[PDB]
């Protein structure tokens, strides 16, 4: 059965989405960055997140398949997203939905 | 690096409607989903006991139409009631996401919007449910007066009315998804039955 | 609406029930076809009762006894199938060949 | 009433600052907010019990000092103004930036007068305040209801 | 020939009652969010995910009652015209039907003692 | 006033093919009974919702409308507006067809409830027996909802819904056989025109039998095991979210209303302010029609009231304490009542 | 040439098409649960066909016993014996079908050759509506032995199934 790490705007599983199911395979490691649209994504920053994920699974993982490890990966991605969202690549969506600043309020960098 | 955590400056703004026959029907739509919010009995700590006292007869919440419901699928609201440890959190995302789309959230307590007292020197608490699901209304206070929950529901009801019917595009999920082969040596599940049928309980060793 | 096509429809259920009676792989799927056959005969009887012998219906009573006995016999059949499922642990009717 | 048009929007565009006397159920006021969003206005409610001088959070740039809990010694964030930032993050075809305040009872006369005077200056900006009360949703200019 | 008089409402009402579900349910898809198909399709096992294997450990605890129900439910169909004709019949058909009922009661006692 | 006659004649005066005229009067009562059925559902929901608050020193909805009058309106409109979800391995045909199967026959059984003489749809010579028949179709829909769901949690509690519904139909049948003795047949008009000055006094036992077997149609907290919220969450319903759950909800309450109306017509009568009515003329017919309708609704309301009032007085029973009512208290007693009524009609054929 | 006889005709052909289609669904579909529900559909359609033929009691009884009780019993017995239906094919899986088909088809034609050749006795008299009092009279005038003897039939069937499915 699945072994997942469901934070906000990072959901990681251990199967292969065929049409909307997941089908745990033990080796596919899907990802679902920001489903709820807390952030407005570009084509570049999202690729940076993708590459971080790829070089964070393969480059440093050779131990068991616990939820501990996937949760650690999700934490590293959710900190990388802070970095992208502070530096100013991506930003909040502003839409008339919730607008809760889960990551941070806007600063000015004095 | 000039305005950190910025706003995105959208375009193609919203293309709202203006005719009266549709906006009155929108008012009926919102009033209907409004005045019959059906919560989910989700209890983890004393916030649930105040929610239970809210069920009671000193002051119910059956009026303005709330039925405490037991399953997520029939439900419309998670009044998040208690602390969210790091071992029950997926058992909350799997209750939230496993629910129909026009659904709302209330975060009662301080142990579930910043971790409260357990926001420091704790190693198993989630310091805010707003980093698990999109909280829609916040009310503070470890155990709050359960009539304050009805203030939060007043404040949530005047936000359901703030919605529009040609605006349900901000209600689905985009699923920006990927795949990655790996090598992490799967282990067997050590979480089964076998509490008394295990050989070691019926076996004083040598 | 005529007697002729009622008889033909019943005969067609009879044919289909035979097809399901010979084609069956399972063992619970045979009683279903048998019940179809019994339904067909009931249908013939009711047709005869309406058209041929009306002022004293006499085939409707016989159909009552038919549905009675068919229910009882289906009960007993499923009881037997529950028991063979205990030993062989299947209902693949082509595994019940104890002769060569 | 049971059905209302867009005269609320005209009253708001005329006066600049209204004061809703909705009931204490919060079920029959968000529709007028919708009628505003149905025109081009964009909203931001930010719950006055939590606003300070109302010249530092709206006009000027102020310093928010988050919660340290023994860890992470005192630090500022300097969030920008609420009225010169959302007003610049509008879409292109934006008529204005209305301002909603849920709990207005807790505020005082002085900042009511300030918010009223702030409608004329800083043009594309309007105000509404939900001062709870009457059993029928009626409104009044916010220059009135004071002095 | 059709002597039942009292139908021609059963038909149309079977139609309209088979048409309320399909129509109240078709008046939902016209106005509702669409599918949300990734993880909202999973099966409710109280927050946690299902274990696996997923069998039931079947039992006769619900079969045998259906069996005896089939018996005693076939039986009642022999009693409605008895009750309805009890005006016309009188005696020697009550004596002749309490035999039926007594043998039924013997079956009931058999199922009861087990 | 024979409204059928004037409707057909006035419509036959401008032509329209008199057979076609007799054809075009069909849908009017056929939808009027749907109107009063839906209204009875709304009333039953509001009644339970306020009386379950009176029992507890509580106050039900008063902010929806004046007094919660518009609460089930909100519920229904919402459940229209909600998303529907079809879980992973569940079947597509059976899932959205279970609730239809369990809901339809309860509506279809409204072709026998009188509300007044010649103020019903098509008095069938079979009548109540057709209700006993159509009520046995619900377990198929329940098992459909159980099988058409990967939720073992559901199927484990959908089989016990086809264990009580398949258990409280035999005494439900015997208690109405005991009425078929008296009334020369099975039609409701004949069950009730036998009362001209009531069967409860002569069926003091079958009343309890019918009324316990009707409450226990997967309805009320004395049993309602397949929706045992505390034992196992909503049983077979927990995967039904939008309008399908509304179909189940509707079905429960409308079946309760049908049970109340049917106890009224069987044992008390949808007429008959208890004096021998018709001892005291269109303007008088329109008066006694209203009087009979009103008294019918009085008795139906009293039974709805008692039914909902057991829900908050009577903790549930596991499954063995339940099925030891059927075949051990309702079925032997129903047989005894049947034999008693038979013997008494044989000895004392007068009064029956 | 009428509206009242036209509804009977249309209803009859609709019910007959439903019967045939649902029986073919019972017999041809690989999954058996669908077959059981379609069998219930067959039973309902046949109960609706009987009403056209002036049999209402037996129709309600078919709806009360077969679909009500027997079909539920089959829906229990089927999940009693579901194990993912892991059946490997045989080489002659087609052969048997073909044989059955032609055999079955022949019978139909043969029966049809009878049904259209023999001069039935239509007996033009209006039937009787009271098809329930008459059956009561026949259970105690003509067909009394089957009543009294189906009693012990049901007893014996209960005694049999109770001691053939018992778990021991
Ligand atoms: S916030 Fe207070 S009431 Fe809520 S769980 Fe924490 S300590 Fe308990």
Report a brief summary of the structure:
The structure is cut from a larger assembly and holds 7 protein chains of 7 kinds. With 206 residues, chain B is of the alpha/beta class. Helices cover 23% and strands 8% of the residues of chain B.
Textual characterization of the structure:
It is classed as proton transport. The entry lists the keywords Respiratory Complex, Ferredoxin, Cyclic electron flow, Complex I, Membrane protein complex, proton transport. The entry is titled "Structure of the photosynthetic complex I from Thermosynechococcus elongatus". The structure is cut from a larger assembly and holds 7 protein chains of 7 kinds. Chain B is of the alpha/beta class and 206 residues long. In chain B, 23% of the residues lie in helices and 8% in strands. Chain B has helices spanning 20-34, 46-55, 90-96, 146-160; strands at 77-81, 104-108, 137-139, 176-178. The radius of gyration of chain B is 22 Å and the shape is globular. Chain C is an all-alpha fold. Chain C contains 3 helices and no strands. Chain F is mainly α and 352 residues long. Chain F has one domain. Chains C and G meet through helix 1, helix 2 and helix 3 of C and helix 1, helix 2, helix 3, helix 4 and helix 5 of G. Strand 3 of chain A pairs antiparallel with strand 4 (176-178) of chain B. The complex binds iron/sulfur cluster. Residues 45-47, 82-83, 109-111, 116, 142-143 of chain B line the site of iron/sulfur cluster.
Which descriptors apply to this entry?
7 chains, C: about 100 residues, mainly alpha, Helix Hairpins, 3 helices, about 0% strand, E: about 110 residues, Methane Monooxygenase Hydroxylase, Chain G, domain 1, 5 helices, flat, binds iron/sulfur cluster
What's the number of structural domains of chain D?
Answer: 1
Tell me the β content of chain A. 5-15%
Shape of chain D: globular
* Radius of gyration of chain A using CA atoms only: 15 Å
Which two chains form the greatest contact, residue counts included?
C-G, 72 and 79 residues
Q: What sort of overall outline of chain A do the alpha carbons produce when their principal axes are compared?
A: globular
Task: Classify the secondary structure makeup of chain A into a structural class.
Answer: alpha+beta
EC number (chain F): 7.1.1.-
Transmembrane segments (chain F): 23-43, 61-81, 93-113, 124-144, 172-192, 198-215, 245-265, 290-310, 329-349
Family (chain F): Belongs to the complex I subunit 1 family.
Membrane topology (chain F): Multi-pass membrane protein
């Amino acid at each position: 059965m699945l072994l997942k790490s469901t934070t906000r705007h990072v959901h990681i599983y251990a199967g292969h989405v065929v049409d909307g199911e997941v089908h745990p395979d033990t080796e596919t490691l899907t990802l679902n960055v920001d489903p709820d649209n807390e952030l407005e994504w570009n084509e570049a920053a999202l690729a940076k997140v993708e590459a971080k994920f790829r070089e964070l699974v393969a480059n440093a993982a050779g131990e068991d398949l616990t939820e501990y490890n996937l949760r650690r990966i999700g934490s590293d991605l959710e900190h990388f997203i802070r970095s992208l969202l502070m530096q100013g690549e991506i930003g909040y969506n502003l839409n008339s939905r919730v607008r809760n600043y889960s990551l941070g309020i806007p600063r000015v960098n004095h | 690096p000039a305005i950190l955590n910025p706003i995105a400056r959208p375009e193609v703004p919203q293309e709202l409607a203006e005719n009266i026959i549709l906006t009155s029907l929108n008012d009926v739509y919102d009033w209907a989903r409004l005045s019959s919010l059906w919560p989910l009995m989700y209890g983890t700590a004393c916030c649930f006991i105040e929610f239970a006292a809210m069920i009671g007869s000193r002051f119910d919440f059956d009026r303005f139409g709330l039925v405490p419901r037991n399953s997520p699928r029939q439900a419309d609201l998670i009044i998040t009631s208690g602390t969210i440890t790091m071992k029950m959190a997926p058992a909350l995302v799997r209750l939230y996401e496993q629910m129909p789309s026009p659904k709302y959230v209330i975060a009662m307590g301080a142990c579930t919007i910043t971790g409260g007292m357990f926001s420091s020197d704790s190693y198993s608490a989630v310091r805010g449910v707003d980093k698990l699901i999109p909280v829609d209304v916040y009310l503070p206070g470890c155990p709050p007066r359960p009539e304050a929950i009805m203030d939060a529901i007043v404040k949530l009801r005047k936000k359901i009315a703030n919605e529009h019917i040609n605006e349900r595009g901000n209600l689905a999920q985009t699923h920006r998804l990927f795949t990655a082969k790996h090598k992490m040596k799967p282990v067997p599940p050590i979480l089964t039955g076998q509490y008394l049928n295990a050989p070691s309980r019926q076996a004083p060793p040598p | 609406m005529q007697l002729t096509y009622v008889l033909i429809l019943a005969a067609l259920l009879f044919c289909i029930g035979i097809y399901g009676l010979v084609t069956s792989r399972n063992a619970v799927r045979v009683l279903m076809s048998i019940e179809l056959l019994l339904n067909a005969v009931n249908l013939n009887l009711i047709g005869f009762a309406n058209y041929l012998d009306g002022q004293q219906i006499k085939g409707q009573v016989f159909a009552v006894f038919v549905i009675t006995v068919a229910a009882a016999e289906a009960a007993v059949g499923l009881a037997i199938i529950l028991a063979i499922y205990r030993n062989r642990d299947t209902v693949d009717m082509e595994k019940f060949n104890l002769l060569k | 009433g049971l059905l209302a048009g867009y005269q609320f929007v005209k009253d708001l565009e005329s006066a600049g600052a209204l004061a809703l006397f909705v009931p204490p159920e919060g079920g029959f006021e968000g529709r007028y907010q919708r009628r505003l969003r149905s025109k081009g206005y964009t909203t931001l409610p930010m719950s006055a019990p939590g606003l300070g001088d109302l010249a530092a959070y709206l006009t000027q740039e102020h310093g928010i000092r988050p919660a340290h809990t023994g860890k992470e010694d005192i630090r500022v964030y300097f969030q920008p103004p609420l009225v010169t930032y959302h007003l610049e993050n509008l879409p292109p075809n934006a008529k204005g930036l209305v301002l909603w305040l849920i709990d207005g009872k807790r505020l005082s006369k002085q900042e009511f007068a300030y918010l009223a005077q702030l409608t004329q200056t800083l043009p594309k900006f309007k105000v509404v305040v939900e001062v709870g009360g009457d059993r029928v949703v009626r409104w009044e200019p916010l220059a009135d209801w004071v002095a | 020939v059709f002597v039942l008089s009292g139908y021609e409402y059963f038909l149309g009402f079977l139609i309209i009652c088979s048409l309320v579900p399909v129509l109240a349910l078709a008046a939902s898809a016209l106005l509702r969010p669409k599918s949300g198909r990734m993880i909202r399709l999973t099966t409710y096992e109280s927050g946690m995910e299902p274990i696996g294997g997923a069998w039931i450990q079947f039992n006769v605890r619900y079969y045998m009652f259906a069996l005896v129900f089939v018996i005693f439910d076939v039986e009642t169909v022999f009693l409605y015209p008895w009750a309805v004709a009890f005006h016309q019949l009188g005696l020697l058909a009550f004596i002749e039907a309490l035999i039926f009922i007594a043998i039924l009661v013997v079956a009931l006692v058999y199922a009861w003692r087990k | 006033i024979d409204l059928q006659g004037q409707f057909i004649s006035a419509l036959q005066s401008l032509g329209l093919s008199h057979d076609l005229a007799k054809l075009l009067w069909l849908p009017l009562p056929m939808l009027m009974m749907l109107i009063v059925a839906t209204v009875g559902v709304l009333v039953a929901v509001w009644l339970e919702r306020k009386i379950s608050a009176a029992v507890q020193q509580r106050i039900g909805p008063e902010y929806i409308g004046p007094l919660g009058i518009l609460a089930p309106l909100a519920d229904g409109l919402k459940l229209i507006f909600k998303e529907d979800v079809l879980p992973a391995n569940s079947d597509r045909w059976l899932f959205t067809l279970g609730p239809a199967v369990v809901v339809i026959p309860v509506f279809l059984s409204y072709i026998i409830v009188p509300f007044g003489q010649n103020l019903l749809i098509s008095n069938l010579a079979m009548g109540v027996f057709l209700w006993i028949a159509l009520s046995s179709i619900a377990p198929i829909g329940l098992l459909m909802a159980g099988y058409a769901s990967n939720n073992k949690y559901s199927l484990l509690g959908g089989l016990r819904a086809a264990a009580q519904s398949i258990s409280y139909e035999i005494p439900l049948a015997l208690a109405v056989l005991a009425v078929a003795m008296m009334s020369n047949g099975l039609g409701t008009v004949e069950i009730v025109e036998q009362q001209s000055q009531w069967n409860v006094w002569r069926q003091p036992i079958g009343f309890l039998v019918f009324w316990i077997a009707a409450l226990a149609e997967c309805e009320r907290l004395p049993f309602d095991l397949p929706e045992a919220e505390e034992e196992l969450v909503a049983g077979y319903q927990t995967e039904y979210a939008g309008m399908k759950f509304a179909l189940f909800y509707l079905g429960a309450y409308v079946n309760l209303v049908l049970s109340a109306l049917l106890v009224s017509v069987l044992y008390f009568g949808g007429w008959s302010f208890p004096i021998p009515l018709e001892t005291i003329n269109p303007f008088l017919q329109i008066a006694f029609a209203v009087l009979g309708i009103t008294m019918t609704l009085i008795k139906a309301y009293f039974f709805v009231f008692l039914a909902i009032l057991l829900r908050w007085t009577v903790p549930r029973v596991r499954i063995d304490q339940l099925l030891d009512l059927g075949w051990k208290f309702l079925l032997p007693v129903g047989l005894v009542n049947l034999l008693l009524t038979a013997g008494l009609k044989l000895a004392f054929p007068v009064a029956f | 040439m009428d509206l009242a006889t036209l509804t009977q005709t249309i209803t009859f052909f609709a019910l007959a098409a439903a019967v045939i289609i649902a029986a073919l669904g019972v017999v041809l579909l690989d999954n058996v649960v669908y077959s059981a529900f379609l069998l219930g559909g067959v039973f309902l359609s046949i109960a609706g066909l009987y009403i056209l033929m002036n049999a209402d009691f037996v129709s309600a009884a078919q709806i009360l016993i077969y679909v009500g009780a027997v079909n539920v019993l089959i829906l229990f017995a089927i999940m009693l014996v579901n194990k993912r239906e892991t059946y490997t094919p045989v080489p002659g899986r087609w052969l048997r079908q073909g044989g059955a088909a032609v055999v079955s088809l022949g019978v139909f034609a043969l029966l049809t050759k009878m049904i259209l050749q023999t001069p039935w006795q239509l007996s033009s008299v209006p039937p009787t509506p009271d098809s329930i009092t008459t059956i009561g009279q026949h259970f105690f005038s003509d067909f009394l032995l089957p009543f009294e003897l189906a009693s012990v039939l049901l007893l014996m069937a209960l005694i049999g199934a109770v001691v053939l499915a018992r778990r021991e």
